[PDB]
Amino acid sequence: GDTLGASWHRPDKCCLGYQKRPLPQVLLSSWYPTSQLCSKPGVIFLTKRGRQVCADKSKDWVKKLMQQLPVTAR
């Protein structure tokens, strides 16, 4: 069902929750850590064009990514 359940403050979006499919690193450019102010903080990546990704920095495959990719910022 769904009904109302009005309790939050009208949320919106923040990330893909966490990458579900496997993602390489030689195909993306860099990444950048997010804040826990959203519904699920963690580490998001950035391809070499204009696409961003969001995965649990604690993801083995991701850790490797964060190691070769620069933590974008500023």
Question: Hey, CA dihedral for 41, 45, 46, 47, is it positive or negative?
Answer: negative
CA distances from 34 to 4, 6, 58, 59 (A): 30, 27, 14, 15
Instruction: Say which amino acid occupies 44.
Output: I
Technique employed here was: NMR
Residues constituting the chain: 74
SS3 64: helix
Report how far residue 68's alpha carbon sits from residue 74's, in angstroms, rounded to the nearest whole number.
Answer: 19
31: left (phi over 0), alpha (psi -120 to 50) or beta: beta
Task: Give me the sheet containing 43-46, strands edge to edge.
Answer: 30-33, 43-46, 52-55
Based on its alpha-carbon atoms, the radius of gyration of the chain, rounded to whole angstroms, reads: 15
Which pairing describes strands 52-55 and 30-33: parallel, antiparallel, or unpaired? Answer: unpaired
Domain 1-74: which CATH class? mainly beta
